[PDB]
Design a protein around this ligand. Structure first.
Ligand SMILES: CC(=O)N[C@H]1[C@@H](OP(=O)(O)OP(=O)(O)OC[C@H]2O[C@@H](n3ccc(=O)[nH]c3=O)[C@H](O)[C@@H]2O)O[C@H](CO)[C@@H](O)[C@@H]1O[C@H](C)C(=O)O
Length: 418
C-alpha cells in the first residue's frame, strides 16, 4: 500500500508540462479495435488506466507495446470478451463492446457493477447498439451483443447526455451500412479527439463537439498515427494548486479553449490569468482566493472532474461558497476527509456549502476517487504540518507522476512503501 507523505505549508510556484488526456487516450485505445492496419497513438500519459487498457487489448488478441507512444496491432483480434476480472477494476472496459460488434459481429462485455461515486447504469450504451440493429442479451453477468452481417445506420436521439454512450455509438457506426445521426450527443473535448482519430483511419464523421454527430459508414478502417490532446483536468488541477497556495504557475503543452468554465471560475476567485496558443499562466499576487459558486454539468460547463479541486479552493478561501453536483450526485467523499484537516463544510443533498478558513492542519486521510482524491494531495501541500494520504493507487490511475510535478513546484512530498 503506497502512501504520500506531505510536508506543509508550501507555496506552489514555477512550471509544469501537461500530459496527454487520460480520457482521450482511453476511448482511442478502444477505437483501435476497428483498425485493420497498425496504429500509433502519441502523447499518451503513463498511468494505471492505460495499462489496464493495454492488458485488455492484449487479451483480445491485439499486439500492444509502449514507451511516449502506444503501438497497437489489431489485425489478429481473435477473442471477443472483456472478462469480469478486468471490467471490475475499470468500468471504461465497456468500451470494447461497440468496436467488437461493429467489426466481428459479436462482443461479450461484463456488465459493470456498483461504483462509489453514484448510480452508473449503461442503458444508453445497450440501447444505442440495439438501434444500430444489434441483438443484446444478458447472461452470467455478461452483456452479449451480436449482429448477422453489419450494423445499420440510424437516427438516434439521446435521452440524456452521456460521454460514454456517445463514444460507443459513434464508434460502432463507423462500420455500419449508411448514415447514423446522434442527437443530443456529448460535446466533451475528448469526443472530438476520438472522432478525429477515427477520421484519420478513414471514417467519415461530422458534428463532433456539437449536439449533432453524423457518421457515414465505410467498409473498413486502416491504420495511422495520432497525437492525443492535452489533459484539461490535469491542467485545472495545477492551476488550482497555485491558486490555493498564493503562488504563480505556467502550464506548458496546454489547450486553453478546453477550459473556458474553469478559467472563468478562477478569475472569480481573484486570479490573474493569461493564455497563449499552448500555455496558461496564473498569478495570485500573494493573495488568498475569493469564495465562488459552482455548478457541475456536461461540457462546456464546469466539469465534475474539477469538483473536489474547487471544493478545496472554497475551503481555504475568503467567505462562503457553494458547489452543486448535477452529474455525479454523490461525489462527496473528499469533504469528510478535508474535515479531518480542519475544513468547515456541510452537505445538503447534492450541494456542499463551504466556509473558508485561514489554514488547514495535517492529518491522515484516505484516497478513493481517481480524480477527486488529488484534492487530498493538494490539501497536504498547503496544510500546516504533516499529512499522510493513504491508498494513492487510486491517484495512480488518473495522474502521471503527480509527485514529480508537485515537487518541481516546491512541494515537500514523498512516496513511501510502508
Ligand atoms: C473513462 C471516462 O472518460 N470517464 C468519464 C466519463 O464517464 P462516463 O461514465 O462515460 O460518464 P457519462 O456517461 O457522461 O455519465 C453520465 C451520467 O448519466 C448516467 N448514465 C450514463 C450512461 C447510461 O447509459 N445511462 C445513464 O443513466 C450516469 O449515471 C451519469 O450520472 O464522463 C464523466 C463525466 O465527464 C467523467 O467524470 C468520467 O471520468 C472518470 C471519473 C475517470 O476519470 O475515469
Amino acid at each position: 500500500m503506497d502512501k504520500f507523505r506531505v510536508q506543509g505549508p508550501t507555496k506552489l510556484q514555477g512550471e509544469v508540462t501537461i500530459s496527454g488526456a487520460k480520457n482521450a487516450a482511453l476511448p482511442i485505445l478502444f477505437a483501435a479495435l476497428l483498425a485493420e492496419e497498425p496504429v500509433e497513438i502519441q502523447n499518451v500519459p503513463k498511468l494505471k488506466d492505460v495499462d489496464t487498457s493495454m492488458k485488455l487489448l492484449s487479451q483480445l488478441g491485439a499486439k500492444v507495446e509502449r514507451x511516449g507512444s502506444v503501438h497497437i496491432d489489431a489485425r489478429d483480434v481473435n477473442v471477443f470478451c472483456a472478462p469480469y476480472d478486468l471490467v471490475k477494476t475499470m468500468r471504461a472496459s465497456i468500451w470494447a463492446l461497440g468496436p467488437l460488434v461493429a467489426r466481428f459481429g459479436q462482443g461479450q462485455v461484463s456488465l459493470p457493477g456498483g461504483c462509489t461515486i453514484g448510480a452508473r447504469p449503461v442503458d444508453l450504451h445497450i440501447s444505442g447498439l440495439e438501434q444500430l440493429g444489434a441483438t443484446i442479451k444478458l447472461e452470467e453477468g455478461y452483456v452479449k451483443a451480436s449482429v448477422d452481417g453489419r450494423l445499420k445506420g440510424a437516427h438516434i436521439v439521446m435521452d440524456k447526455v452521456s460521454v460514454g454512450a456517445t463514444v460507443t455509438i459513434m464508434c460502432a457506426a463507423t462500420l455500419a451500412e449508411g448514415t447514423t445521426i446522434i442527437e443530443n450527443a456529448a460535446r466533451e473535448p475528448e469526443i472530438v479527439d476520438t472522432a478525429n482519430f477515427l477520421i484519420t483511419l478513414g471514417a467519415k464523421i461530422s458534428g463532433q463537439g456539437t449536439d449533432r454527430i453524423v457518421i457515414e459508414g465505410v467498409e473498413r478502417l486502416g491504420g495511422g498515427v495520432y497525437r492525443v490532446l492535452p489533459d484539461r483536468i490535469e491542467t485545472g488541477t495545477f492551476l488550482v494548486a497555485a491558486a490555493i497556495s498564493r503562488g504563480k504557475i505556467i502550464c506548458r503543452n496546454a489547450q486553453p479553449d478546453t477550459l473556458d468554465a474553469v478559467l472563468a471560475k478562477l478569475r472569480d476567485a481573484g486570479a490573474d490569468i493569461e493564455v497563449g496558443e499552448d500555455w496558461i499562466s496564473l498569478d495570485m499576487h500573494g493573495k488568498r482566493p475569493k469564495a465562488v459558486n459552482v455548478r457541475t454539468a456536461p461540457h462546456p460547463a464546469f466539469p465534475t472532474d474539477m469538483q473536489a479541486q474547487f471544493t478545496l479552493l472554497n475551503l481555504v478561501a475568503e467567505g462562503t461558497g457553494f458547489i452543486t453536483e448535477t452529474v455525479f450526485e454523490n461525489r462527496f467523499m473528499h469533504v469528510p476527509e478535508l474535515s479531518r484537516m480542519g475544513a468547515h463544510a456541510e452537505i445538503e443533498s447534492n450541494t456542499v456549502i463551504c466556509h473558508g478558513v485561514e489554514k488547514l492542519s495535517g492529518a491522515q486521510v484516505m484516497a478513493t476517487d481517481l480524480r477527486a482524491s488529488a484534492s487530498l494531495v493538494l490539501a497536504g501541500c498547503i496544510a500546516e504540518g504533516t499529512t499522510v494520504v493513504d491508498r494513492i493507487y487510486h491517484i495512480d490511475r488518473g495522474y502521471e507522476r503527480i509527485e514529480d510535478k508537485l515537487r518541481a513546484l516546491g512541494a515537500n512530498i514523498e512516496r513511501v512503501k510502508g
